[PDB]
């Protein structure tokens, strides 16, 4: 139909493309490589061939599909690794034993021959169905509970509903008729990837995201459906944090996408998730792999596909959101996406606004982040799903003044600042308290109050203690260890304890792998209450000596209790909530009694 005119890396030029519209999928060459119109000029047009363009030739056929970028968002996507173009990796490897990814394969996104146990809902013949109405549900596997929903922009009266039983994706299920014509609906639904799936309304989110890591859970919390950013400069290995969130978050579904991510990481994910189990209220063993889908394409994969990868990931997340589930997506190394934008824009000679990154960088990144949120779903029943986006902006050279980091910090709500200093010291979380900040603190005030009113005060006090610790460290470095106030000594103490125990998690040990919120609150309360007892002792100690000067002697005589305080983190969560809460009550009361008695002694 059409033929290629110019090829320049990923970006190509095809002649005879008069009827083509922007953002229309197109087949390139004999191998039918995927392509999406970006710049149309005259009869010619521009195509960003997602696949590798090496080996093309002039006058290679170019076939217009007339349809924009689309993903087959039907059931069965859960638990399967897909390429940036939604192609199934495992099926491709099975069909062609060559482990190398072929070029020119056209394996469908989802198998047309799988039989799924289909459970029709309370729908009846002639009922007035609307767009987004859950006419039925299907069990993809254990803990999936997939809900087949009518595609948006569809309505009519139920002329036919399929009976319960196994069904191929070709099978028609609903035969709704709106304007007389009776159209059939099949399980597969395709959504323009770039366009954002419609929502009935957007509502404020008030459910905190439980990461299971003390520092992020308490110091800089995030709400479900919120937007987060992790810089994670080179060597910090942010992917361990991302994987921990995927394993131990309270999300209903995980959509992990890595653009530019190294292949080993995806191997590790696919090999380790199935064995790892999560405990539901029923308690049966179940693999997070069922709960997780992987859209990542490795760094070896062509760069043009980074956008397509990220947009397919987010649209799959949105699809699960409309099903009523609360899904979280992690976008590994969006800096690779920025570099992909720069490379594509560079070929088009589009003017470099700043550091080679094109001008329309903030806009696209803003849209990507803005697709997140907590929404009221469409149709019946009245589902309220959400999408949580936790992206990654790797700073080139570790300078946060970078353009992608700047735009992200501009449009992000909660920000977790990774720093090289803690990473070098083998701190492990490496989450710097000063730079990190959460704009969601005000929203979660209600949840904190209903959970524990003490949490707000202890959180503010811990922040103040950390800031004072930084200021005192600077002042001491300027002056020296000597001439250090006893009150300042008490402040630096238990702040060192905060850093060593509460703000750090091993993340590779059974105890520190997952930190429940209640035990985090207990540890923070223990730290602040020890600090407050120290302040009270400084206030009154039968003379300034016993009050504050003897803080060193207090540390000597309270060494066992201080060691218990620092070791409280070492206990595993497998003991169960009653065991941990009883132990923390015992520790706090013993510390208070010992401190008061020692404060009573000689005073």
């Amino acid at each position: 139909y059409g033929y290629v005119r110019k090829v320049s890396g990923p970006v190509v030029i095809a002649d005879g493309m008069n009827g083509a519209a922007m953002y229309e999928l197109v087949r390139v060459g004999h191998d039918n490589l995927i392509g999406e119109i970006i710049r149309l000029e005259g009869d010619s047009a521009t195509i960003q061939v997602y696949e590798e363009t090496a080996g093309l030739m002039v006058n290679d056929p170019v076939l217009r599909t007339h349809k924009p970028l689309s993903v087959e968002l039907g059931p069965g996507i859960l638990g399967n690794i897909f390429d940036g173009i939604q192609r199934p990796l495992k099926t491709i490897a099975i069909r062609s034993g060559d482990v190398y990814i072929p070029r020119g394969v056209s394996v469908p996104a989802l198998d047309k021959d799988t039989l799924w146990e289909f459970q029709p809902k309370k729908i009846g013949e002639g009922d007035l169905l609307t767009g987004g109405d859950l006419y039925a549900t299907v069990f993809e596997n254990s803990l999936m509970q997939h809900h087949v929903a009518l595609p948006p922009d569809a309505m009519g009266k139920v002329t036919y509903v399929a009976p319960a039983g196994q069904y191929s994706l070709k099978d028609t299920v609903l035969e709704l008729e709106f304007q007389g014509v009776k159209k059939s609906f099949t399980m597969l639904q395709a959504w323009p990837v770039r366009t954002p799936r419609p929502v009935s309304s957007k509502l404020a989110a008030d459910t905190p995201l439980l990461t299971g890591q003390r520092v992020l859970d308490a110091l800089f919390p995030s709400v479900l459906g919120g937007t987060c950013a992790i810089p994670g400069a080179f060597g910090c290995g942010k992917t361990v944090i991302s994987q921990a969130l995927s394993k131990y978050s309270n999300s209903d579904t995980v959509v992990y996408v890595g653009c530019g991510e190294r292949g080993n990481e995806m191997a590790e994910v696919l090999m380790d998730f199935p064995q790892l189990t999560m405990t539901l209220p029923d308690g049966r063993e179940e693999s997070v792999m069922k709960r997780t889908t992987l859209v990542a394409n490795t760094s070896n994969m062509p760069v043009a596909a980074r956008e397509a990868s990220i947009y397919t990931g987010i649209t799959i997340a949105e699809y699960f959101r409309d099903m009523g589930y609360n899904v979280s997506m992690m976008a590994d190394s969006t800096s690779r996406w920025a570099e992909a934008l720069r490379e594509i824009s560079g070929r088009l000679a589009e003017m470099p606004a700043d550091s080679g990154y094109p001008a329309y960088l903030a806009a696209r990144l803003a849209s990507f982040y803005e697709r997140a949120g907590k929404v009221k779903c469409l149709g019946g029943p009245e589902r309220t799903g959400s999408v949580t986006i936790v992206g990654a902006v790797s700073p080139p050279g570790g300078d946060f003044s970078d353009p992608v980091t700047s735009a992200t910090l501009s449009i992000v709500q909660v920000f977790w600042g990774l720093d090289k200093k803690l990473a070098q010291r083998k701190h492990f979380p490496s989450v710097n308290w000063l730079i990190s900040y959460s704009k969601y603190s005000t929203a979660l005030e209600s949840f904190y109050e209903q959970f524990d009113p003490d949490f707000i005060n202890i959180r503010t006090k811990a922040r103040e203690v950390l800031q004072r610790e930084d200021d005192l460290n600077e002042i001491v470095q300027l002056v020296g260890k000597d001439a250090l106030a006893e009150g300042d000594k008490i402040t630096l103490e238990t702040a060192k304890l905060l850093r060593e125990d509460y703000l750090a998690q091993n993340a590779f040990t059974p105890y520190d792998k997952f930190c429940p919120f209640y035990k985090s609150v207990w540890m923070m309360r223990n730290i602040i209450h020890f600090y407050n007892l120290a302040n009270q002792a400084v206030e009154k100690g039968a003379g300034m000596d016993g009050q504050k000067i003897t803080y060193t002697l207090i540390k000597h005589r309270l060494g066992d209790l201080f060691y218990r305080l620092v070791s409280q983190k070492f206990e595993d969560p497998a003991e169960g909530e009653p065991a941990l809460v009883a132990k923390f009550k015992k520790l706090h009361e013993d510390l208070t009694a010992g401190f008061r008695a020692l404060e009573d002694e000689t005073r």
Partner: protein, 52 residues
């Protein structure tokens, strides 16, 4: 006491003040040049190509 204070001030200066300011100057020079000059020259070249 005075000699200890003066020696501490001098050692602190040599070990912190200059050792922090010199990296600041180096980073400022690197950013200024490698960003402003590079991108300005690139913009000028792109404009020249456009005219060409």
């Amino acid at each position: 006491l005075t000699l200890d204070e003066a020696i501490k001030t001098t050692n602190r200066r040599v070990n912190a003040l200059e050792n922090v300011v010199k990296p600041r100057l180096e980073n400022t020079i690197t950013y200024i040049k490698g960003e402003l000059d590079e991108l300005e020259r690139e913009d000028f070249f792109r404009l020249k190509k456009i005219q060409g």
